[PDB]
Design a protein around this ligand. Structure first.
Ligand SMILES: Cc1cc2nc3c(=O)[nH]c(=O)nc-3n(C[C@H](O)[C@H](O)[C@H](O)COP(=O)(O)OP(=O)(O)OC[C@H]3O[C@@H](n4cnc5c(N)ncnc54)[C@H](O)[C@@H]3O)c2cc1C
Ligand SMILES: Cc1cc2nc3c(=O)[nH]c(=O)nc-3n(C[C@H](O)[C@H](O)[C@H](O)COP(=O)(O)OP(=O)(O)OC[C@H]3O[C@@H](n4cnc5c(N)ncnc54)[C@H](O)[C@@H]3O)c2cc1C
Ligand SMILES: O=c1ccn([C@@H]2O[C@H](COP(=O)(O)OP(=O)(O)O)[C@@H](O)[C@H]2O)c(=O)[nH]1
Lengths: 391, 392
């Protein structure tokens, strides 16, 4: 078989690339996936007992303000009207979350108006200006104030990262909306929803073109030399972990990984909301997912439910990495791997993309936007005009 | 102009649904007679001068429906925003998630209650009174949600709404009083909702737009009907004004509650961070405060000013606008008498009675529109198109 393009990894970055090359240029694409399933961390599957669709790697919520991405993804799936909301469990109480008049009134024990809340938080955040903040801890404190930081941010962050907050990226906290209204949407984007027929169906729709071949249970590094030899003109888009690609030659990047405990309970409803964060040090998990709440429109049992406890730890050499940590030390090692990546692009026509491929904290919509850009601006001209990958 | 096929009295959503359907679906000429200086009844909206913020001066209007036919119908006249209504409740100086659900329950009882423990808690508290033995509104409420939640969020709010001790209100007043056993605080349960993108008045004007519809404002039907009907004798009348006034209050006066509003512009960009705040306590005279900028987040409103509207409830005296039917036993008897008079009037004078005022029934917008579409399909359109009897 002949191929015009190799894609390593079948997550949203890889499949966006594969779909674009196949449909927009008529190219033959081989997608190589080491896991037994498609879709990267966005993969979903039914829990056998209940038939409830489970997100295998914990809740995945789609949201974007990029209309071009919204138009693109709607070609492969419809979306529900779901809007994500998260509650935070702290000292035995469930709190409205994230930062907003709900959290403020609950935590400080009486109603604060928008102007009263702004004044309160300003005093409590005064040790640092959001302008000046050098790191996660400083930025977080500057936005929500020290008391709310100590209660809802500090120990959740310790569990999720096991890394000094002063050495975590400031951009980690700005993922969360900061409001002085009673709005408690977890995201602040124009479009959001869940795929009506689930994530796995969406992903399979992206790989549906007959010019796309997907090989699961296959490690690129075991098969690449013979594949490339048989198709030497084909470039490669790699979306596996960046340090692993170069056999950790420049050091090991710090990654976090997750373990899950899935449980079917003999009640119809465990927590009354899709995601409950556990912000205290006294429980091992960071949050519990209850998946029935994502799809009320489905034929789900009324006397059973599936929940999933999420636990975070360091990615060892055995594990598969889920989160880039990006300490200052990580960033120096990153700079070395970026030099290696650019060299491999020039020498071996290998492009690097995605959360793992670029060591970036990317959501689905970010990964898809990035892949659309790579295709239009870099890969398509190489594939169809023989333009250089060295732009 | 003229040569009217149909008279419609009142230009609220019920009357305008009737007029628009008769005009566009049957090609009939309609005269809409409206005693107010504007169309739309209480759904009429307008800009507050100082801020430019769109307000609903007859009361806050939130649109919602679970009927797809009604949804598809109203979308011919307006687009809708993605607004979802949510309400918060102020009690003893704290803001609560509302309606009663796991959020409120956790806040009020001082710790997290799971769906199962909340269910057990409410069942235990509700068991103080058997619902069958409930002798009034207060006992029935307690028998459904338990004494703490009743006394915190229902008792005094109800007292301010009806200006009456809930002990003196009938158990009949209460159909269901659910506590939600999830954290869902979307106020309405309906499938479709949103605010009209260009506001209610523009939506209403679009319903009245067909050239076969003529509208006469500042005009009382009873001043003009005799000569109008003489000139157009077989045009039926769809009357959506007060049922008792129609018959000169001959069977008594139907009891209604009214609302007073106080509109105020404040020198802050945001007064309460949410569209509607209920005030559950006896220590403030208003039931609710509306902040209209939050009805339309998508608009560019002033960053340093806001308009709020305090709402007050009381019995509607003779010069007051009637809002909600009281429905005492005496009222229901007065209503039965007028219902008989109305049926006789439909037979002898071809007058149909409809809408909130014409039927002594509170109707939401989508209820009124659904009711008018039903009257049209079942009664008025077969009459206008085939000469079918209006008596059913
Ligand atoms: C716990 C977690 C929760 C998340 N929640 C959200 C959310 O709520 N909303 C949102 O928008 N995004 C969320 N994301 C991000 C999302 O899962 C993806 O990271 C995002 O879609 C980016 O996709 P990707 O293709 O870049 O990477 P990936 O999804 O990781 O796909 C990379 C693929 O490369 C494969 N691969 C790796 N090495 C090899 C190799 N040698 N050979 C062959 N194949 C290989 C991997 O098996 C993997 O399938 C979450 C991610 C994680 C880990
Ligand atoms: C405070 C208040 C708040 C409301 N909030 C909501 C909400 O949040 N969501 C929702 O869906 N609905 C709400 N509604 C209901 C909404 O107003 C509906 O559009 C209305 O009930 C529709 O019924 P209608 O058209 O028959 O009533 P109306 O809107 O009252 O129309 C009746 C019309 O008949 C006119 N009229 C009366 N007598 C005469 C006469 N002799 N001659 C000529 N004209 C006459 C009246 O001036 C009026 O314009 C609210 C209603 C009120 C009063
Ligand atoms: O209850 C919470 C939620 C988030 N965060 C911080 O915000 C970061 C991003 O939160 P997100 O909800 O985006 O994390 P993900 O779902 O990507 O694991 C986390 O890593 C934490 O450091 C926190 O401290 N407490």
């Amino acid at each position: 078989g002949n191929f015009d393009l190799f894609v390593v990894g079948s997550g949203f970055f890889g499949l966006t690339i594969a779909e674009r090359a196949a449909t927009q240029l008529g190219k033959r694409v081989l997608v190589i996936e080491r896991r037994p399933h498609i879709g990267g961390n966005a993969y979903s599957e039914p829990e056998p007992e209940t038939g409830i669709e489970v997100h295998k790697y914990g809740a995945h919520l789609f949201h974007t303000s990029n209309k071009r991405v919204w138009d693109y993804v709607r070609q492969f799936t419809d979306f529900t009207g779901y809007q994500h909301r998260v509650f935070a469990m702290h000292n035995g109480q469930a709190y409205q979350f994230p930062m907003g008049l709900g959290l403020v009134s609950q935590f400080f024990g009486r109603y604060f108006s928008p102007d009263e809340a702004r004044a309160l938080i300003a005093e409590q955040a005064s040790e640092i200006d959001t302008k000046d903040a050098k790191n996660f801890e400083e930025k977080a404190i500057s936005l929500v104030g020290r008391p709310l930081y100590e209660a809802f941010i500090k120990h959740y962050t310790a569990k999720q990262w096991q890394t000094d907050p002063k050495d975590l990226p400031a951009s980690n906290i700005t993922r969360l909306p900061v409001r002085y209204t009673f709005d408690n949407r977890y995201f602040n984007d124009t479009y959001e929803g869940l795929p009506v027929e689930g994530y796995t169906k969406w992903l399979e729709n992206m790989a549906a073109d007959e010019r796309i071949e997907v090989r699961l249970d296959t490690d690129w590094f075991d098969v690449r030399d013979d594949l490339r030899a048989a198709n030497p003109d084909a470039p490669v888009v790699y979306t596996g972990p960046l340090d692993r690609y170069f056999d950790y030659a420049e050091g090991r990047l710090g990654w976090r990984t997750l373990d899950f405990e899935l449980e079917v309970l003999e009640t119809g409803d465990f927590q009354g909301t899709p995601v409950m964060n556990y912000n205290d040090l006294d429980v091992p998990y960071t949050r519990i997912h209850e998946f029935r709440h994502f799809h009320p429109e489905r034929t789900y049992p009324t006397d059973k439910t599936v929940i999933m406890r999420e636990y975070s730890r360091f990615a060892d050499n055995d594990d598969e990495p889920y989160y880039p940590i990006n300490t200052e030390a990580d960033r120096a090692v990153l700079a070395a791997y970026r030099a290696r990546a650019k060299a491999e692009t020039a020498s071996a026509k290998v492009l690097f993309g995605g959360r793992l491929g670029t060591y970036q904290y990317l959501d689905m919509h970010m990964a898809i936007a990035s892949a659309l850009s790579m295709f239009d601006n870099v890969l398509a001209p190489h594939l169809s005009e023989g333009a250089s990958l060295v732009t």
